[model samples]
Every structure is written in C-alpha cells, then in structure tokens.
Target: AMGSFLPKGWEVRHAPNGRPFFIDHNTKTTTWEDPRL
Candidate 1:
C-alpha cells in the first residue's frame, strides 16, 4: 500500500478509465502525478 507515503488528506484513487490519480482532500485538488514521488 502507498498509504505510508501519502501526506495527510492525500489519497490515491482510480478513475473511470482505470487510471490512477492523486487527490488532496485538504486542498481539494486532483492530479495524475504521485505526490509521494
């Protein structure tokens, strides 16, 4: 799991097309880049 590396309120989710994405609940932002990277 990538949970150990994610920041607070940050999570990884899959799109309808099955693409992985990063979401920041704190900022209400979504992106394709992995914040852990």
Candidate 2:
C-alpha cells in the first residue's frame, strides 16, 4: 500500500530483505518495510 502523495523523485523498490522499500533521491533517505504489526 502507498499513499497518493509521495515526495518528488521518491519511489518504491524491493530490497533483498524482501519488503517494501523507499528511496528519496533528493534527501537520500532510505526506508525499510515496516512489519505488519
């Protein structure tokens, strides 16, 4: 699931850990998938 609004140049990619991943080109921020807890 993804929000309708995402920052510019930010997109989702799958990591080797097998989860939803996000990378921000502008800020160079990387986020891993949060477990469905």
Candidate 3:
C-alpha cells in the first residue's frame, strides 16, 4: 500500500480513474509523481 508515503489531506477521491493520487486541498499548484518510484 502507498500509505507509507501519504501527505496531508491526501485521498483516493481525486483518482476517480483508479490510479493512485495524492490530493492536497491546501494547494493550487499540485504536481504528479509516478507511483512506481
């Protein structure tokens, strides 16, 4: 599981397409990182 690398307020809700994503509601400058890393 990716629980070992979660940031604040991260949720699976942002990933409606079924890939893992980290959501931070506190930002407007969100970026992406490969989960394979």
Q: What is the clash count for each candidate, in the order shown?
A: 0, 0, 0
Supply the global lDDT for candidate 2.
0.68
Clashing pairs in 1: none
Can you tell me which runs of candidate 1 are displaced by over 4 Å?
1-4
Score residue 24 of candidate 3 by CA lDDT: 57
Q: Predictions ranked by TM-score, top down?
A: 1, 2, 3
lDDT of 3 by residue, 1-37 (tens): 5546656554444466776554456664344653324
Best of the candidates, TM-score? 1
> Regarding TM-score, does 2 or 3 come out ahead?
2
Instruction: List pairs with backbone clashes in candidate 3.
Output: none
lDDT of 3 at 31: 46
Per-residue lDDT value at 25 in model 1: 94
lDDT of 2 by residue, 1-37 (tens): 6555766787778868877777878888887743221
Better of 1 and 2 by lDDT: 1
lDDT of 1 by residue, 1-37 (tens): 4534788888889999999999999899999998877
Evaluate all candidate structures by whole-model CA lDDT and list the values in order.
Answer: 0.87, 0.68, 0.51
TM-score to native of every candidate shown: 0.71, 0.56, 0.31
